Amino acid sequence: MLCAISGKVPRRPVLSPKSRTIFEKSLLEQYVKDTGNDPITNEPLSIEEIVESAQQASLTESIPNLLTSLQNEWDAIMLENFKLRST
Amino acid sequence: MLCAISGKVPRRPVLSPKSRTIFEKSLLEQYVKDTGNDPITNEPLSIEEIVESAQQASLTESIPNLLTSLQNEWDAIMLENFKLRSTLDSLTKKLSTVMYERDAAKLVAAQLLMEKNEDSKDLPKSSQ
Amino acid sequence: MLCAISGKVPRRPVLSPKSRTIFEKSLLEQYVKDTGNDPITNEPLSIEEIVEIVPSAQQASSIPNLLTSLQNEWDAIMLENFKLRSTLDSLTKKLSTVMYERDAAKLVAAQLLMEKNEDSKDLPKSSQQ
Amino acid sequence: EIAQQASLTESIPNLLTSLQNEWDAIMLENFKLRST
Amino acid sequence: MDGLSFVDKIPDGYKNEIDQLVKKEFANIKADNSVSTLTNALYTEYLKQRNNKKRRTPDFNDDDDTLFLEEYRRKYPRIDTSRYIPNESSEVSLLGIVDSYLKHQEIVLDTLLPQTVSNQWRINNDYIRQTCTIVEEMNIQQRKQINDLEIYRKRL
DSSP, X not given: OOOTTTOSOOSSEEEOSSSOOEEEHHHHHXXXXXXXXXXXXXXXXXXXXXXXXXXXXXXXXXXXHHHHHHHHHHHHHHHHHHHHHHO | OOOTTTOOOXXXXXXXXXXXXXXXXXXXXXXXXXXXXXXXXXXXXXXXXXXXXXXXXXXXXXXXXXXXXXXXXXXHHHHHHHHHHHHHHHHHHHHHHHHHHHHHHHHXXXXXXXXXXXXXXXXXXXXX | OOOSSSOOOOSSEXXXXXXXXEEEHHHHHHHHHHSSBOTTTOOBOOTTTSBOSXXXXXXXXXXXXXXXXXXXXXXXXXXXXXXXXXXXXXXXXXXXXXXXXXXXXXXXXXXXXXXXXXXXXXXXXXXXX | OOOOOOOOOOOOHHHXXXXXXXXXXXXXXXXXXXXX | OOOOSSSOOOOHHHHHHHHHHHHHHHHHHOOOSHHHHHHHHHHXXXXXXXXXXXXXXXXXXXXXXXXXXXXXXXXXXXXXXXXXXXXXXXOTHHHXXXXXXXXXXXXXXXXXXXXXXXXXXXXXXXXXXXXXXXXXXXXXXXXXXXXXXXXXXXXX
């Protein structure tokens, strides 16, 4: 949603395969043409290394997020027992 | 923004360096343990080769997470995949009807290529 | 359920607070009295640095693995749906490329039948006269 | 940052009501320890 | 195999006539555990496994198992008020930021629609130039043929 170099909303996001971070294409290309590196971790990265199937997706809403929700329910209830056991 | 195995919106997305395709961590870790290769391009890939926030507003009426939400998730999983098996069986029947009518049309053109040129040749022989 | 010095089942499992590896109280104390170090990473370690008890207190020795089992069975559901949709779209390409080419090859016959028909009437009107 | 043995419950609709019972029991095993 | 599409300007009766020729040739030639077993059976029967609605059913002045039921209702109300208290503290703001995430995802799909639309037009654009050139080669071939048929009768 943001570009880690500038802070703007990227209109052409490309993700680097050395430090995973969503960079804007026109910004990161100038960073790579300056020196052949990734701006976060200073590891080597080329222009072909930066990259912009069939199973359709749906939005993350309240199966997987429901299973991680019940983790939060119980891990909080587990702390509620410690407030009781220590008292 | 999505996972390229399940069709999720990942919470801990990881990207592979042999083919850059963003996958959710648990699903890509499961594939490399099953058969140690990239699922998309079938190239060599390992767990160490992988390179590592989303908000979901819970509903105001959040008993329902145990009863009503959880039944609808395992209903929608069950009905969709069965309808998807019904989708995969029908196309393989429609694949057979495609190739048979294709090979039927090939025999038409093979029959008619002998008909047309010999009909034109008999027009050239007619002049003599 | 193994020590990281000899490999025995630890009856008093102790751990060094420099490199996280559960040892046994007898062997790690004999290593520390030998040289004041950690056996795995060779960092500085003492006897008082070691944590030496079973930890159980205010804890009361189910629920949790049932959600973990529900995660594990969904993991198979997601992998099966991928290979099932992959075979769906791949033959839909075979379905589409055939049906377009079938109607394209169908137009070959409509052109070829009309030319064959023209050569029939041309020759018959000529061979008559 | 410092034995893993997988549960193999039994030989799926019953596992739904098993989870329903365990959250029902844990809610009561939490409530009884508070009024005490 | 060579059937001109843009060039041939082919009636619906020719489609019916050619299909009968194809139909006449057609007459001549003539990985899971037990979860998959439950999911396939439930979808084939179309029946869903029943959840426990007993917590809605509970009533006063009932036995010891239902005393467990009413205390279950108290723990559910305290959890429900705690869950409602987090949402109130968060405010709409939390529903607002997830909506901004959805607009960014939706825009990426529309760009993929233009990329495919631009490429499918380009494949058609290359095909259209080939059809027009294949038209003139066929038309010149037909004109030369009609000359030869007329000339051969004239010489004889």
